[PDB]
Design a protein around this nucleic acid. Structure first.
Lengths: 49, 154, 145, 112, 102, 48, 116
RNA sequence: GACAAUGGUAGGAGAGCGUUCUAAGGGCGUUGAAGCAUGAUCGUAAGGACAUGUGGAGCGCUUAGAAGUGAGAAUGCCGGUG
RNA sequence: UAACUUGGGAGUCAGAACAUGGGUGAUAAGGUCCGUGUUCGAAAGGGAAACAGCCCAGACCACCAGCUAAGGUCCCAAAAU
RNA sequence: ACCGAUAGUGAACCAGUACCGUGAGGGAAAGGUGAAAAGCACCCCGGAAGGGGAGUGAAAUAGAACCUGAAACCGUGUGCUUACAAGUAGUCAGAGCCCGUUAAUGGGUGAUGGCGUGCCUUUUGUAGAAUGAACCGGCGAGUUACGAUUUGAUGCAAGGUU
């Protein structure tokens, strides 16, 4: 190819979900966590099993 | 927070001053610092399977062949390094601004006579990679390097 | 916003009417007069300017009250002072200031906006059949059924 | 033609100087001197010193007739403040703003 | 001398000579558009349409295939993190009546 | 004790419309000098 | 690399201050109070585009009702008989005949009146 | 061309817009870059231009990379200013 | 016109009022606890004067077009003195 | 594909320094004239500061607080409005009076009418008399490494891989 016309393969690359950036992304305020409880805190949740 | 200097002192007391709960002078909302998730020194390199490296290098110089940017010549015979002479070599045979000369073993006089022209790069046949093949507009391989890249890439 | 006639100054002509009020019940007289003042009898009616014309009510002391609401139907009034509630019956307003009896019936059928206060200013109610406004040249208007 | 003078960083506060400065504007240059000599505000010897300076820049630099001039503009802008503190009670300081002013009067005869 | 044409989904009170704004027809500029649905002709002689006047076209020349002024459609909910903002230019046609019929 | 709301720029400027100052006496001294304050004897730059 | 908050915060906030021109005092200068008023006014503009279609049909019926009582008709009996005539004219066009051409309105009154 | 769908919070999915940097290509600039200010411009949106001032040196665009990438709220922090 | 199976990702375990079947209480509660619906929650629009839960009715966006539902038609204030 | 002066060392500046503490200890803020100082000779007002000229310079609203100078805030002017009016400050509808554009079924103002109890966070439910914000500006929060599992993509395949 050329270094100014190179493009990735189709389906190879997605952009990642930045979470916690504004209302319209759907992951804005509470950031996919829901409101309260142990799962909504940083480092929270509980161990597998 | 753990790396900025100072800030072990809790700056005021927890209840009863009328001000917000702050815990150190160096918390990340303070001006003095403490960065939350910034750069860490990491390594960005990764690897492919090594059948996928041969194929990426064959596809980079078949794109040169199919668009006729492959000019095989005989041996370069430079006794002394002379940039003025090598620039005339790239003009007697017509070449674009970016060119990539390739020899079999390391020719010390070609690699010095082309070292100063902007756009030209000298490479051993063993040292071909995808990013100077696809950067150049045209290859100029030799006889001894064309047979050498043919043996190791196939 | 294609094409709707919106009335204006230099576009409306307000005339003068006289309503004889003898032998008329209060709020049937008052409701017909309230739509002459606002302009709803006009085809060039706009709600935001004062189309609508002048009404003189000339008898006003010969007003019918059906039922028992000349001893009943107290009119209340508070003075914005503690225990300053004050009352007068409808019959006691008919014999004493019958002009304010009618022009509070009609002004209560008008809106309380800045335009409804100036549309109520076009009403001139007189107890007893003589009005001063012969210069303004009003016409007779018969109330509709 | 107009003639102006300014007085930058005058330690009188801008609110206190705009009182007397509203008395003289629009008025002719002779009677504006007489108002600033008779009001007993602190600013009255300071605007008068600036009104003297702009009538002098009219006669000297622009060769105007200083007998017939009128005060067009008479305003005072804010300058940089000096932020002082003040110990009140129970270890509790409170800020005092030493305000400054840029006093500007311009004078003209209304002709071009 | 006076007509009510029906065009778009609505009715326009037309006189001959004036510039009228209709929802977008499928003609180009500079053409001549004839209106097929006249409901009332008045002026001197008054022809009331039965639903229509059974004939009585209105020809008009076409000026300015255009887009309207942009309106911004913003609706939000009061505490719930939900809003939507969108813009709208509505297409129009600027015809000009030049000949009436009855 | 404390203001429940801030006063606006409009309400502040409506309050201080009577926060003004008057022009003084300004009578001429007919003997000599500039304008003196009315019913006052001059001290400097005048003969009252 | 570090990207700092340069020049994109003002450009988003200036076009809300500029969009709030003509508001009382603080509500056209400060960002937090003009943003809330522009959100409020876009909600009002959506709402009142839907009510302008109600408040003009309300205006036309009041004028047809006042023009039909000059011919001893109600609004209700007029457009009953004007539908029995087959007339498919609006409330808007009928309100503009009645102001402009008074005889042409009276001639479709006597087509609705004998349709009953 | 028909037909159908399109309120929406936790939340799931999709497609985008801007930001700084890199690579390659192609560019623009004292005949005035970026900023800044103003405007009645364009796009469905985040946004994009243009013009004119100011400003006195840089900065776009295309494609693809990387992220300290987007603020109105935390009795947030630091500045000013009421 | 769905359903089911497998897999990736979830949020919720404080509900509310009406109507109705009940317990409890006092055939008391805008009470409480269940069965059953609907609505709100998460649903703006119209009506119930105002009025999350009632009544009608689900908003892709323009329109100064028409018919209608609950409700209404003297005046406020559209339409039957 | 590190930072650009609230960043980056606390510290780009006569920093562990002013400053604070009895003491250990805690600990700042503060970069930018111009190419060149050519850093305003003289004149005027003033006690001086300051100004107004003149002059230097490409530029002096580049004058030593000196590159650009944004908002909050403070002013001075104005075009249209306003002293019978009950207001979440708009929004549609609109006369009047001004004005002339990135010229397009324009711009400013608003007599009057209709509608209309801020925003977050919390909640069964908030105009809420529940919480948070004086305003403006900057800063300020799902990252990285390693492993695991899933898809997507691409190798080549009974093998694939270092």
């Amino acid at each position: 190819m050329k270094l100014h016309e190179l493009k990735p393969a189709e389906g190879s690359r997605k952009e990642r979900n930045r979470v916690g950036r504004g209302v319209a992304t759907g992951n804005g305020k509470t950031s996919g966590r829901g409101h309260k409880g142990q799962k909504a805190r940083s480092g929270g949740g509980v161990r597998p099993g | 927070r753990s790396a900025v200097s100072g800030g072990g002192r809790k700056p005021w007391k927890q209840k009863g001053t009328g001000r917000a709960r702050q815990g150190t002078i160096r918390a990340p909302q303070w001006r003095g610092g403490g960065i939350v998730f910034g750069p860490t020194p990491r390594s960005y390199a990764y690897k492919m399977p090594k059948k996928m490296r041969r194929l990426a290098l064959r596809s980079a110089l078949s794109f040169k062949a199919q668009e006729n940017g492959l000019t095989v010549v005989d041996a370069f015979n430079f006794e002394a390094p002379k940039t003025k002479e090598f620039k005339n070599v790239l003009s007697t045979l017509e070449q674009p601004k970016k060119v990539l000369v390739v020899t079999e073993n390391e020719d010390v006089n070609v690699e010095l006579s082309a070292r100063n022209i902007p756009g030209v790069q000298v490479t051993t046949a063993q040292g071909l990679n995808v990013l100077d093949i696809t950067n150049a507009d045209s290859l100029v391989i030799t006889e001894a390097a064309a047979k050498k890249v043919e043996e190791v890439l196939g | 916003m294609r094409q709707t006639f919106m009335a204006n100054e230099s576009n409306i002509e307000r005339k003068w009417y006289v309503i004889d009020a003898e032998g008329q019940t209060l709020g049937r007289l008052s409701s017909e007069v309230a739509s002459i003042l606002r302009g709803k009898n006009k085809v060039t009616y706009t709600p935001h300017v004062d189309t609508g014309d002048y009404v003189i009510v000339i008898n006003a002391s010969k007003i019918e009250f059906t039922g028992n609401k000349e001893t009943d139907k107290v009119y209340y009034r508070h003075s914005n002072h503690p225990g300053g509630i004050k009352s007068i019956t409808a019959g006691e307003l008919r014999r004493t200031n019958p002009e304010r009896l009618i022009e509070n019936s009609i002004k209560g059928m008008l809106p309380s906006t800045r335009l409804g206060e100036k549309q109520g200013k076009k009403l001139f109610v007189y107890g007893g059949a003589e009005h001063p406004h012969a210069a303004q040249q009003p016409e007779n208007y018969e109330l509709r059924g | 033609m107009e003639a102006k003078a300014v007085a930058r960083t005058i330690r009188i506060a801008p609110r206190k100087v705009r009182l007397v400065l509203d008395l003289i504007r629009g008025k002719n240059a002779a009677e504006a001197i007489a108002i600033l000599k008779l009001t007993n505000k602190a600013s009255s010897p300071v605007i008068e010193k600036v009104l003297m300076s702009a009538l002098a820049n009219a006669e000297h630099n622009y060769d105007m007739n200083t007998d017939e001039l009128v005060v067009k503009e008479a305003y005072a802008n804010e300058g940089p403040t000096l932020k002082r503190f003040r110990p009140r009670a129970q270890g509790r300081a409170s800020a005092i703003n030493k305000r400054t002013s840029h006093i500007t009067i311009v004078v003209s005869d209304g002709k071009e | 001398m006076f007509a009510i044409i029906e065009t778009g989904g609505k009715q326009i009170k037309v006189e001959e000579g004036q510039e009228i704004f209709v929802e977008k027809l499928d003609v180009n500029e500079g053409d001549t558009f004839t209106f097929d649905k006249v409901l009332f002709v008045g002026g001197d002689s008054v022809k009331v349409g039965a639903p229509t006047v059974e004939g009585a076209t209105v020809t008009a020349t076409v000026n300015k295939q255009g887009r309207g002024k942009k309106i911004t459609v913003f609706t939000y909910k009061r505490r719930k993190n939900s809003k939507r903002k969108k813009g709208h230019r509505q297409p129009y046609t600027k015809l000009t009546i030049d000949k009436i019929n009855a | 004790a404390v203001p429940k709301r801030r006063t606006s720029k409009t309400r502040k400027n409506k309050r201080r419309t009577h926060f003004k100052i008057s022009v003084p006496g300004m009578t001429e001294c007919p003997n000599c000098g500039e304008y003196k304050l009315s019913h006052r004897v001059c001290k400097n730059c005048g003969s009252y | 690399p570090r990207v700092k908050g340069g020049t994109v915060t003002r450009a988003r906030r200036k076009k809300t201050i500029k969009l709030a021109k003509g508001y009382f005092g603080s509500k056209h200068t400060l960002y937090k109070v003009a943003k809330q008023q522009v959100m409020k006014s876009g909600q009002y503009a959506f709402r009142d585009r839907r009510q302008r279609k109600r408040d003009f049909r309300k205006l036309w019926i009041t004028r047809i009702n006042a023009a039909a009582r000059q011919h001893e008709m109600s609004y209700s009996r007029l457009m009953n008989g004007l539908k029995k005539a087959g007339i498919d004219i609006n409330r808007k066009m009928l309100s503009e005949i009645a102001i402009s051409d008074e005889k042409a309105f009276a001639q479709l009154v006597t087509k609705a009146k004998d349709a009953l």
